[PDB]
C-alpha cells in the first residue's frame, strides 16, 4: 500500500481522474472518474 504521485509532465493519458503510481507493480497508475465509459477517462457516456 505505497502509492506515489505523478509530476506535471506525466498527465498524458487520464484527463478526468488522478495520476498516481503502483509500488507492487511499478507502473504509472491513473484512476479515472467513476461514471466515464472507458478505462482512460476521456469520453463521458452520460
Amino acid at each position: 500500500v505505497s502509492i506515489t504521485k505523478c509530476s506535471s509532465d506525466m498527465n498524458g493519458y487520464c484527463l478526468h481522474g488522478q495520476c498516481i503510481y503502483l509500488v507492487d507493480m511499478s507502473q504509472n497508475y491513473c484512476r479515472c472518474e467513476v461514471g466515464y465509459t472507458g478505462v482512460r477517462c476521456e469520453h463521458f457516456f452520460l
Side-chain angles (χ1 to χ4, degrees), residues 5-23:
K5 251 190 186 132
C6 288
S7 204
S8 205
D9 214 88
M10 226 148 186
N11 228 293
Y13 173 76
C14 50
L15 311 198
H16 312 84
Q18 284 193 275
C19 202
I20 53 174
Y21 164 92
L22 255 289
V23 73

Side-chain angles (χ1 to χ4, degrees), residues 2-42:
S2 218
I3 191 114
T4 318
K5 251 190 186 132
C6 288
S7 204
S8 205
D9 214 88
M10 226 148 186
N11 228 293
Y13 173 76
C14 50
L15 311 198
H16 312 84
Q18 284 193 275
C19 202
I20 53 174
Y21 164 92
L22 255 289
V23 73
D24 296 277
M25 214 187 262
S26 52
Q27 164 142 270
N28 214 60
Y29 187 108
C30 269
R31 164 61 77 158
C32 292
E33 167 197 299
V34 191
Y36 256 89
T37 177
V39 75
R40 177 234 31 231
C41 31
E42 185 244 63

